[PDB]
Amino acid sequence: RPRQYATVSKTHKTVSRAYGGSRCANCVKERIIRAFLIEEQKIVKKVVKEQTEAAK
Amino acid sequence: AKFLKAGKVAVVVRGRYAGKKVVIVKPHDEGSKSHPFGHALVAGIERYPLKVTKKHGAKKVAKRTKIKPFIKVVNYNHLLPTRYTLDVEAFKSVVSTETFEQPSQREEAKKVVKKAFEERHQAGKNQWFFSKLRF
Amino acid sequence: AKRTKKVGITGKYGVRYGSSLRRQVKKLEIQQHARYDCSFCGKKTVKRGAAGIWTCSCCKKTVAGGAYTVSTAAAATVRSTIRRLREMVEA
Amino acid sequence: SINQKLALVIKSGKYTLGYKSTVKSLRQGKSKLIIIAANTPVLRKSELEYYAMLSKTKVYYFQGGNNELGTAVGKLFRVGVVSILEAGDSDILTTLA
Amino acid sequence: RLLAKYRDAGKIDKHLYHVLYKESKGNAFKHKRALVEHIIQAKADAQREK
Amino acid sequence: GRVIRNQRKGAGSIFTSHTRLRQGAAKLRTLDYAERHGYIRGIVKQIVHDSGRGAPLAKVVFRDPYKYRLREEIFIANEGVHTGQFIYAGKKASLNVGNVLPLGSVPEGTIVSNVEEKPGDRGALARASGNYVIIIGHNPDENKTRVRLPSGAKKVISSDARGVIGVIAGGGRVDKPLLKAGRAFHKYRLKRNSWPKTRGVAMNPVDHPHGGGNHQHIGKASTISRGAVSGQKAGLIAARRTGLLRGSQKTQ
Amino acid sequence: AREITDIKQFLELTRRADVKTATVKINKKLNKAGKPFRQTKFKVRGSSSLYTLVINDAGKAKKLIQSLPPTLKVNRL
RNA sequence: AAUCCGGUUAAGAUUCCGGAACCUGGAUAUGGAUUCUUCACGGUAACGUAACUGAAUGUGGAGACGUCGGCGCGAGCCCUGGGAGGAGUUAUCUUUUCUUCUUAACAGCUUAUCACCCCGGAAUUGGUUUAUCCGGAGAUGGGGUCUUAUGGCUGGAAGAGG
RNA sequence: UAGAACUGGUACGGACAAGGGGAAUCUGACUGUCUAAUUAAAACAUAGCAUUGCGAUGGUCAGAAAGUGAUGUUGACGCAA
RNA sequence: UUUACUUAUUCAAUGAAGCGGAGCUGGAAUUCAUUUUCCACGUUCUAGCAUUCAAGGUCCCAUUCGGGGCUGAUCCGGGUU
After folding, report:
1. Which nucleotide is nearest to G25 if distance is taken from CA to C1'?
2. Do C25 and F177 touch (CB under 8 A)?
């Protein structure tokens, strides 16, 4: 029950991962991969602006 | 044609170190005696150094630049490999199968790995490997 | 077997209500309680609940759409109009 | 079109189906071609794009969903992504990929 | 569960299992002994086709 | 003598809206600087059932541009949006289904809905289940825009008033027969207090002006003046013609 | 409340200086199906909960009663 | 937010008495754990361990919930067997007929559908429900992880009640 | 659950419990609702069909008045008559 | 005549957040002397993220661990639109 969580230790309320007790594993998996690939792809989004805008 | 070489940066997606950047120090495509799957021994950081500015005092700089590393066997399915690299041959000869069981040797390895990551963070080559994968 | 000669699902209504109203209900409850293809995962698993809302059972995709079918005919042409009206800006 | 080509590969060469075996046969570099379906999720699609630019393997988008790809390769179950590892009679590795 | 322990006992393979299972979802078998008598006849037909 | 029913609706004791299960007001984003110069990307979290609306709603979330938080708004879901689609609001936002654009940024002939009357009042016209307005013309003189409302009446509004692209989900709703009285009952217990509709011929001459008499008949003429006092207006209101309509549609 | 199974932990409990009262209880229960034998329980009362120890063997229990600290008030049976 | 059993009265008790708990609030000392790899380790993983800094601010969950149908599972009642006590019947018959044989909150270890992880790869399509759903977006299979409403054992506790 | 003998002053859902049925016409389609203390109906309601008003500095209505309110957490597949 | 007015009046919205005018870089644009004009003037495969008067650059304090100023983020007018 929602106020019983206070009486208990932290290892019952949390699993060890980042975004541990709030999101589940698979979802966390997705928000690493997306959070990698987009902020790798955005790197490509700057190598286009250095070549299209310069060789215009 | 083989991009899991022993210098590649990877990102651990599973485990307690999820979202934390490692480098492969030794891959194993066939596996091993135990671990019946393609695994790789990696070493990465657990606490990122914080954004030190112009106006931090020197001692309060150094407590920012502490780095907590870790060595770990990780399956290939739990790593994103990436195009970034890191020179590994300083602590290549430390992290091995013998570095494990008798875990007192693990802290001896973490000493070497921490010293290597601080000596690379000073003279700040590899800026992306030490920046927080903000996810 | 086929336990009704023609009525089918509107046999839950029985005798009453007319025949034209019951066949007009049949025509829409076949479409309403059907199992549609999912546009994203390709598995024929999109049902509905709460008219206007078509959730895929797996894959968690929740496509809005027509009340009694996924894409009504007066909307499937609208996107084609949009497909016509996005081309004029460039080519 | 490409379907006669994939059918000739599928009865002449060696391949694997589905995402996990593409990544398994792609980490080992045994891949020569991957073919991604159209209705695939964009995250899966970008994760297989990103492994192409490490392994230097060519990527051909299959226009049309995984149903049509499964029907094209001769199976009955759907398949989102195919990995050709040895082409046989057909030479799709060198056509326009 | 008779089909289940027949499959797990190796007395029958999974192809004949998935035939007889969706047949048992229909009637096709009034009782347990009748199903065993059906399996004996089909397995004897398979042996006479061997 | 007695105060008749449509007079009695207005003070609003029991005739109020039944507003418990409703999620909230279904408005658009407030027109601000991030909207009318660039384009802001939000996602749509959840498209949820509203109670008493025909159309389904849509939980769209936005970044606040000024303080670090997330402001959720609820759009009326255009037909063909799913959860996880990105929604681009604003002046320079591109033209796809579900985006919301000011009407100066669309070509004429475009099918939009939830559009505004005056710019900024967050979504007035064409909101119900299945409807849409079509932009039929632009006017760079005093930047107006001539559109087609769902009654077939044409209206000239500003091009600064925003509208979201596409028809509204929940369409085709009134095609199905409402076979029994239980479905009309369960319908109107979510909307408001106006069912059953007791005919005004049945009742006594205190209850209604169509009442009384040894036959149920309407008495005098049942097309009533616009200039009638509040309380006489009982039947067809200000009718210019009546009777069963004849002829084709798409009038002049 | 609890059951505490460690003898040296129980000796630590007896010297915890909040334990003012203890008591001993005797029962008779039978091994596997054959034979009745004497069982004992040692109960120390802490300020929150009651800590017990179950001893089936009299050859340890008789030495353990000797091993209690003498300042404790032991309700014997 | 947090409680139960047994007893007590001419009349009160989940309120008194005895035994046993729990929660909130506020004080605080002692161990344990952490540290010269200054703010923990293990496991491929799912996650686990008595503990294992963390503000402003943001997000997420709980509180949070329709009715109907069968299906599974537990609890209490019911039926019933063996044995150990008491009462009744008996002209004859009846290993007979009735009655007692109980166990609380709370605590420790353990225990489940569903969900999930790894290995592996499927059409001679295969798993499976009472109800036809599920699978290359990776099943069947081998080995695991978790929730603990529930059950069992042990403590409370046979020193109580019968 | 089905069958078989054998037997009973042809009795056997033995007490209890527990449909009378058919041929028609008038009438309202139906389930529903009401005159609580004489009327339960063929009346009212209903789905269905149709009509009328109105694009909000609006349509219907309220308020003694208001910097007021009901439909309206509304928009013509809508509200209202 | 109704046109052109904002300050009255009336409506509407926002925890009155970027309004008006000018300039900058690009660029359509053709020069009939030099610019006569007008547009733009940080984000689009992805259900990730975005907060500590902001990092950097520059000037100070009196160097302590730190703190201040300008710019980064153009000026002008104080009519929220």
Report:
1. H159
2. yes
Both structure tokens of E22: 């969706």
H or E element, residue D25: helix D19-27
The C-alpha atoms of residue D42 and residue G3 are separated, in whole angstroms, by 57
Question: Is the CB of residue F81 less than 8 Å from the CB of residue F37?
Answer: no
Sheet containing strand D81-86, edge to edge, reads: D14-17, D81-86, D33-36, D58-61
A23 in contact with B, Cβ within 8 Å: no
Angle between helices D19-27 and D42-55 (to 10 degrees): 20
Q: Which two tokens stand for residue C79?
A: 């996107």
Residue C50 CA to residue F198 CA, distance in Å, equals: 31
Q: Is the peptide bond before F65 cis (omega within 30 degrees of 0)?
A: no
Chain F 192-211 contacts with nucleic strand J (CB below 7 A): none
Q: What DSSP assignment string belongs to G16-74?
A: SSS--EEEEEEEEEESSSS-EEEEEEEEEE-SSSEEEEEE--HHHHHHHHHTS-TTSEE
Residue pair F200/F213 in contact by the 8 Å Cβ criterion: no
Technique behind the model: cryo-EM
Of chain G, the end-to-end C-alpha distance in Å amounts to 20
Residue type, B8: K
Q: How far is CA B58 from CA A17, B62, B66, in A?
A: 33, 7, 13
Contact between residue B13 and residue B79 where contact means Cβ atoms under 8 Å apart = yes
**Does the C-beta of B13 come within 7 A of strand H?**
no
The nucleotide whose C1' lies nearest the CA of A53 is J26
Residue F103 CB burial class (10 angstroms; 0-12, 13-18, ≥19):
buried
**H or E stretch at C78:** helix C78-85
User: Radius of gyration of chain A from Cα atoms?
Assistant: 21
- Nucleotide closest to F202 measured between CA and C1': I44
- Residue indicated by tokens 């998996």: A29
Is the CB atom of residue F212 positioned under 7 angstroms from any atom of strand J? Answer: no
Structure token pair of residue F111: 């099918």
CA atom of G15 to C1′ atom of H31, Å: 14
- Six-digit token pair at G56? 């089936």
- In this complex, the chains that touch A, judged by 3 or more CB pairs closer than 8 A, are B, D
Residue type, B22: V
What are the residue ranges of helices labelled H in chain A?
10-13, 25-47
Q: Which residues of B touch D28 (CB under 8 A)?
A: 2, 29
* Residue tagged 């286009």 (tokens): A48
Cβ of F39 near strand J (distance < 7 A): yes
Q: In C, which residues are within 8 Å of D78 by CB distance?
A: 42-43
Residues 6+ apart with CB under 8 A from B28: B35, B38, B39, B40, B41
Q: What angle, 0 to 180 degrees and rounded to 10, lies between the N-to-C axes of helices A25-47 and D42-55?
A: 60
Could you give the CA distance from residue F202 to residue F224 in angstroms, rounded to a whole number?
A: 19
